[PDB]
Design an enzyme around this catalytic site. Structure first.
Site, PDB file in Angstrom:
ATOM      1  N   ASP A   1       1.457  -5.668  -4.675  1.00  0.00           N
ATOM      2  CA  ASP A   1       1.141  -6.879  -5.432  1.00  0.00           C
ATOM      3  C   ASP A   1       1.124  -8.040  -4.450  1.00  0.00           C
ATOM      4  O   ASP A   1       2.173  -8.629  -4.132  1.00  0.00           O
ATOM      5  CB  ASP A   1       2.198  -7.109  -6.511  1.00  0.00           C
ATOM      6  CG  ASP A   1       1.904  -8.301  -7.408  1.00  0.00           C
ATOM      7  OD1 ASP A   1       1.051  -9.182  -7.074  1.00  0.00           O
ATOM      8  OD2 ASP A   1       2.593  -8.349  -8.451  1.00  0.00           O
TER       9      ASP A   1
ATOM     10  N   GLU B   1      13.697 -11.723  -5.908  1.00  0.00           N
ATOM     11  CA  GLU B   1      12.692 -11.413  -6.878  1.00  0.00           C
ATOM     12  C   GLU B   1      13.384 -10.588  -7.963  1.00  0.00           C
ATOM     13  O   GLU B   1      13.650  -9.395  -7.801  1.00  0.00           O
ATOM     14  CB  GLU B   1      11.491 -10.750  -6.233  1.00  0.00           C
ATOM     15  CG  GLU B   1      10.240 -10.781  -7.107  1.00  0.00           C
ATOM     16  CD  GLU B   1      10.240  -9.642  -8.122  1.00  0.00           C
ATOM     17  OE1 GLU B   1       9.684  -8.552  -7.828  1.00  0.00           O
ATOM     18  OE2 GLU B   1      10.814  -9.864  -9.208  1.00  0.00           O
TER      19      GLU B   1
ATOM     20  N   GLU C   1      14.906  -6.187 -18.541  1.00  0.00           N
ATOM     21  CA  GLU C   1      15.533  -5.456 -17.424  1.00  0.00           C
ATOM     22  C   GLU C   1      15.497  -6.298 -16.167  1.00  0.00           C
ATOM     23  O   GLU C   1      15.080  -5.823 -15.108  1.00  0.00           O
ATOM     24  CB  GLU C   1      14.838  -4.089 -17.189  1.00  0.00           C
ATOM     25  CG  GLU C   1      15.115  -3.118 -18.339  1.00  0.00           C
ATOM     26  CD  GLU C   1      14.602  -1.693 -18.160  1.00  0.00           C
ATOM     27  OE1 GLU C   1      13.663  -1.451 -17.362  1.00  0.00           O
ATOM     28  OE2 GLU C   1      15.158  -0.810 -18.858  1.00  0.00           O
TER      29      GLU C   1
ATOM     30  N   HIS D   1       1.398  -7.371 -10.989  1.00  0.00           N
ATOM     31  CA  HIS D   1       1.906  -6.122 -11.575  1.00  0.00           C
ATOM     32  C   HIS D   1       2.688  -6.395 -12.897  1.00  0.00           C
ATOM     33  O   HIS D   1       2.885  -5.492 -13.711  1.00  0.00           O
ATOM     34  CB  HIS D   1       2.745  -5.346 -10.538  1.00  0.00           C
ATOM     35  CG  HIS D   1       4.170  -5.782 -10.444  1.00  0.00           C
ATOM     36  ND1 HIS D   1       4.562  -6.926  -9.786  1.00  0.00           N
ATOM     37  CD2 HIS D   1       5.295  -5.253 -10.974  1.00  0.00           C
ATOM     38  CE1 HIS D   1       5.871  -7.064  -9.881  1.00  0.00           C
ATOM     39  NE2 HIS D   1       6.335  -6.069 -10.614  1.00  0.00           N
TER      40      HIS D   1
HETATM   41  N1  LIG Z   1      23.121  -6.255  -9.351  1.00  0.00           N
HETATM   42  C1  LIG Z   1      22.401  -5.885  -8.295  1.00  0.00           C
HETATM   43  N2  LIG Z   1      22.845  -5.980  -7.036  1.00  0.00           N
HETATM   44  C2  LIG Z   1      22.089  -5.590  -5.986  1.00  0.00           C
HETATM   45  N3  LIG Z   1      20.843  -5.101  -6.148  1.00  0.00           N
HETATM   46  C3  LIG Z   1      20.291  -4.986  -7.364  1.00  0.00           C
HETATM   47  C4  LIG Z   1      21.051  -5.370  -8.522  1.00  0.00           C
HETATM   48  N4  LIG Z   1      20.300  -5.141  -9.593  1.00  0.00           N
HETATM   49  C5  LIG Z   1      19.116  -4.647  -9.171  1.00  0.00           C
HETATM   50  N5  LIG Z   1      19.135  -4.535  -7.836  1.00  0.00           N
HETATM   51  C6  LIG Z   1      18.027  -4.108  -6.979  1.00  0.00           C
HETATM   52  O1  LIG Z   1      17.175  -5.235  -6.858  1.00  0.00           O
HETATM   53  C7  LIG Z   1      15.822  -4.825  -6.561  1.00  0.00           C
HETATM   54  C8  LIG Z   1      14.817  -5.651  -7.373  1.00  0.00           C
HETATM   55  S1  LIG Z   1      13.133  -5.292  -6.954  1.00  0.00           S
HETATM   56  C9  LIG Z   1      12.781  -6.451  -5.620  1.00  0.00           C
HETATM   57  C10 LIG Z   1      12.891  -5.778  -4.255  1.00  0.00           C
HETATM   58  C11 LIG Z   1      12.503  -6.600  -2.996  1.00  0.00           C
HETATM   59  N6  LIG Z   1      13.371  -7.812  -2.832  1.00  0.00           N
HETATM   60  C12 LIG Z   1      11.071  -7.054  -3.035  1.00  0.00           C
HETATM   61  O2  LIG Z   1      10.835  -8.238  -3.389  1.00  0.00           O
HETATM   62  O3  LIG Z   1      10.116  -6.282  -2.749  1.00  0.00           O
HETATM   63  C13 LIG Z   1      15.777  -3.310  -6.790  1.00  0.00           C
HETATM   64  O4  LIG Z   1      15.686  -2.690  -5.492  1.00  0.00           O
HETATM   65  C14 LIG Z   1      17.104  -3.011  -7.493  1.00  0.00           C
HETATM   66  O5  LIG Z   1      17.728  -1.812  -7.088  1.00  0.00           O
END
Ligand SMILES: Nc1ncnc2c1ncn2[C@@H]1O[C@H](CSCC[C@H](N)C(=O)O)[C@@H](O)[C@H]1O
Ligand SMILES: Nc1ncnc2c1ncn2[C@@H]1O[C@H](CSCC[C@H](N)C(=O)O)[C@@H](O)[C@H]1O
Lengths: 327, 327
Positions: free
Chosen positions: A17, A109, A118, A269
């Site tokens: 994306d 993000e 979620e 996305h």
């Molecule tokens: N409470 C938490 N602490 C740490 N990581 C978390 C979390 N809740 C979700 N995540 C993680 O946060 C990510 C969000 S997706 C974004 C991923 C990356 N920063 C990018 O921009 O491409 C996922 O990998 C998920 O596993």
């Protein structure tokens, strides 16, 4: 080896994306003056891409916190790019991570479908409270929600499909339009789907604004965020329901950079979140469409988004339809 | 109203598949001389479309048997087309339906992904034994299975994605190719996916033939159907695995009409079933590819397809990889 199909596909989709990922890269780079020599916490670092954007922008130290197994890949991407003195990938949830200092900035993000399905927003706010220095930078800093009445062309095609069977096969199945309407519109699930500009029936209305530094935002999220809206349709159309979408804003720090998921802007996305009426309603030029919308956690699953909607189209009586995010 | 999203989408997809639905219409119509004035059992009648094709072909009486709630729609399509004296829609599984006579013909679309995944074939054979007159017509009458080595271009793109991140975002993620390969090819699931002719690396080989009138075919299905194969590659390519597909044949009743799901022929909703190696293997002109393949029911779910495969590519040692249909 562990089974990791979901891992790679989710991260592939995010990094593919370009609208999303360039908005974060430019959003971050444009704050180079504020980040140069400073410390950053990346909440949910994933593959580590945003942490590396922060290093490119000049940060001295970036803490890349990631709860799931993709952290292993993040560690590798950092080692491989030779940034292990500047970017530290740390395992596990941000709620229990131990950093050696407060940070100058948080990047994340965190946005889900319909913004709040979620989403990691509660985790970002938990980290802001625990780790962000007074007056620290938040990237992005805010989010806004929008709603508008829509006519979904792909839904229209699906509703009309049964009346075209005769032309193709000599069997008349037009009697199944009722059935198709009930099944495709009569449910109470939020449908993620990409629209275009021509699907939009009126001026989009902002119905909430979320300033991530605002005190008590956690409690707002639990009570429900949203509000009233009103608009006027542009012309004759079969209205199928509403679309909701978001934008988030990065301070410049220059003018702000906005990452938008509107149907008028390049597709992401996230697409949009659609709220279908039980059946179509014909609207005309100047048909008034109003209502009240709230986004909150589902009762039986606090990470599933629910939408409470009460609306009125033209001279039709007010109606309630409440939704929960599709499976 | 009942929740019926799945109902309408499955039937929409089948009827929208013109290759499928025209093959049945023409397959049936071309047997008009054998059907005119005769009786037909439609096993798994769905929306009733094939039953109505049989009436168009001249049948006096068609029993349209359908186990799930879509029978209600079938009844309506028949009433609406004014064929309720000629087509009788009957509720429930064919295994317990009570007809008032043996039939002159059975028609059924029973084929699943990879032919035998979640297929109704056992139900068709149960109905043939119980209800079909000696020498009666079966539409289709047979099925054949094919295998060939393939190079999947869409998989190739996904494997290469991580090496293109640098060009787009200044972060080198090429170190993730290993990861991506393990996740996308290292699993043991059959992947349904549409290929084109250029993905095919050798002459396709037929590995089984299923004559629906053959005695003991039920027991063959339980022991496993399939066999050996051998072929020779056309040129240099990254081989990702194998594709399997089927065709079914309608007697004319003239020459037979074949409904094919080959990548060389117009696409169908069945696409093909892909069996990926754990990683790519480079092949060249004349590389020998051989093996043995068996299709059988999974142990823990008798309606899920499993594939046992032992294969050899060129001078590489023989290898086993066994698969089960994706979730
Ligand atoms: N409470 C938490 N602490 C740490 N990581 C978390 C979390 N809740 C979700 N995540 C993680 O946060 C990510 C969000 S997706 C974004 C991923 C990356 N920063 C990018 O921009 O491409 C996922 O990998 C998920 O596993
Ligand atoms: N044992 C059984 N008896 C009767 N119907 C069955 C069955 N097993 C599956 N079915 C039904 O068979 C159908 C197969 S799909 C094919 C539908 C239709 N004949 C068409 O060609 O468009 C489904 O509607 C499914 O509910």
């Amino acid at each position: 080896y562990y089974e990791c199909y979901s891992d790679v596909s989710v991260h592939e989709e995010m990094i593919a994306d370009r609208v999303r990922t360039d908005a974060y890269r430019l959003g971050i780079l444009r704050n180079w003056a504020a980040l140069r020599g400073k410390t950053v916490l990346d909440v949910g670092a994933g593959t580590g891409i945003l942490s590396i954007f922060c290093a490119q922008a000049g940060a001295r130290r970036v803490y890349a916190v990631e709860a799931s197994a993709i952290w292993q890949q993040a560690r590798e991407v950092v080692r491989f790019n030779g940034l292990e003195d500047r970017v530290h990938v740390l395992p596990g949830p941000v709620e229990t991570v131990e950093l050696p200092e407060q940070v100058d900035a948080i990047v994340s993000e965190w946005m889900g479908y319909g913004l709040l399905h979620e989403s990691m927003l509660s985790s970002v706010l938990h980290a802001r409270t625990k780790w962000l220095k007074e007056g620290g930078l938040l990237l992005p800093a805010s989010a806004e929600l929008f709603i508008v009445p829509i006519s979904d062309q792909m839904l229209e095609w699906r509703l009309g499909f049964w009346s075209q069977v005769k032309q193709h096969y000599g069997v008349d199945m037009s009697c199944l339009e009722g059935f198709a309407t009930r099944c495709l519109m009569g449910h109470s699930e939020i449908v993620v789907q990409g629209l275009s500009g021509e699907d939009v029936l009126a001026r989009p209305q902002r119905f909430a604004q979320l300033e991530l530094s605002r005190a008590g935002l956690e409690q707002e999220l639990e009570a429900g965020v949203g509000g009233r809206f009103r608009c006027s349709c542009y012309g004759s159309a079969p209205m199928h329901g509403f679309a909701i979408w978001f934008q988030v804003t990065f301070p410049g720090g220059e003018k702000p950079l906005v990452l938008s998921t509107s149907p008028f802007h390049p597709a992401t996305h996230w697409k949009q979140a659609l709220l279908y009426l039980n059946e179509p309603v014909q609207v005309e030029q100047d048909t008034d469409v109003s209502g009240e919308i709230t986004l909150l956690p589902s009762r039986d699953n606090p990470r599933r988004l629910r939408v409470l909607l009460r609306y009125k189209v033209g001279d039709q009586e007010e109606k309630t339809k409440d939704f929960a995010m599709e499976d």
